[PDB]
Amino acid sequence: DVAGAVIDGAGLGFDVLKTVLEALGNVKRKIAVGIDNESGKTWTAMNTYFRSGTSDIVLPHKVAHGKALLYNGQKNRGPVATGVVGVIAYSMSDGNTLAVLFSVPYDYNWYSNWWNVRVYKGQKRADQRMYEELYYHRSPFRGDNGWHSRGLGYGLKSRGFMNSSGHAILEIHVTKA
Ligand SMILES: [Cl-]
Numbered sequence: 163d164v165a166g167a168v169i170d171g172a173g174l175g176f177d178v179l180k181t182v183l184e185a186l187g188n189v190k191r192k193i194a195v196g197i198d199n200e201s202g203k204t205w206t207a208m209n210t211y212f213r214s215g216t217s218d219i220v221l222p223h224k225v226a227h228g229k230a231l232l233y234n235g236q237k238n239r240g241p242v243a244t245g246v247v248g249v250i251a252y253s254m255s256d257g258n259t260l261a262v263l264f265s266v267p268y269d270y271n272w273y274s275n276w277w278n279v280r281v282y283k284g285q286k287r288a289d290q291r292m293y294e295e296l297y298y299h300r301s302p303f304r305g306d307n308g309w310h311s312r313g314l315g316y317g318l319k320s321r322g323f324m325n326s327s328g329h330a331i332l333e334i335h336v337t338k339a
Contacts, residue, residue, distance in 0.1 A: 165219045165234040171198045174230040179331040182234055191215070191237040191245045191266050193330040198230040200337040201318055203255035205231075211288035214238065215246030215266075225252070235264070243268045245328075249296060251288035258316060259286045263296035266305075266330045275305025277332055279312070279320040305330060313339055 163169055163178050164185065174196045182194030199205055207221040210233075217235040225231045235246045250262040259282040267273035278296040286292065296302060303310040305324035313319045314336070322334035 163232065165194070165217075165232050166222060168222045168225050168229040168231050171200060171228050171230045174198045174333065174335075176331060176333065178232070179333060182232055183329050183331065186234060186236055189236050189239070191268060191328045193235050193246055193264055193266055193332060195233040195235075195250070195262070195264060195332045196230055196334065197225075197233075197250075197262065198333075198335040199225045199227055200335065201254065201260075202227050202338055205252040205254055205260060208251040208253055208259065208285070209287050210235075210251070211249045211290065211293060213247040213290070213293055214244045215248065221250065221252075237268070246330075247293075249288040249292050251286065251292070253285055254281075256316065257285070258283055260336065261286070261288065261292060261296060262334065263293070263302060264324075264330070264332055265297065265302075266328060270328070275324055275326055275330055276302045277305060277322065277324045277334075278302035279314065279322065279334060279336070281314045281316045281318060305332075
């Protein structure tokens with residue numbers, strides 16, 4: 163149950179994400195991401211785009227139906243007052259893209275955690291334009307310690323949760339609508 167592995171879907175929960183957080187160690191901002199695939203079809207990694215921060219982790223390459231992927235990121239190291247903000251992209255078996263946004267800021271006096279999920283038509287790599295779409299235009303969910311559910315179209319829906327603090331967990335389930 164490490165970032166970069168897939169686990170039986172049922173196994174994904176807050177604790178496994180906490181384990182992922184902890185293995186990152188003493189850094190100011192960071193995220194553990196778990197996405198559970200009940201789409202009915204296989205996901206293959208495309209790429210992650212970072213607006214800010216990094217990960218030393220290779221996105222799990224294949225995520226079969228019934229598996230969950232484990233991933234992480236963290237702020238750029240050293241004296242930069244910045245967080246960890248990015249977009250993950252997976253290609254699905256139907257030829258479309260599953261896109262996930264995470265945003266953990268540095269300054270909670272002025273900013274909050276956000277996340278989002280959307281299915282794009284075709285093969286689309288994560289990039290800055292996708293960032294701006296998911297963040298400014300496609301109604302992102304606040305990391306407000308609450309669950310949020312939404313239809314993805316394409317026969318699918320999303321359910322996920324993200325906390326509100328600088329050590330973020332983000333738990334997403336993709337299921338048949
Ligand atoms: Cl904000």
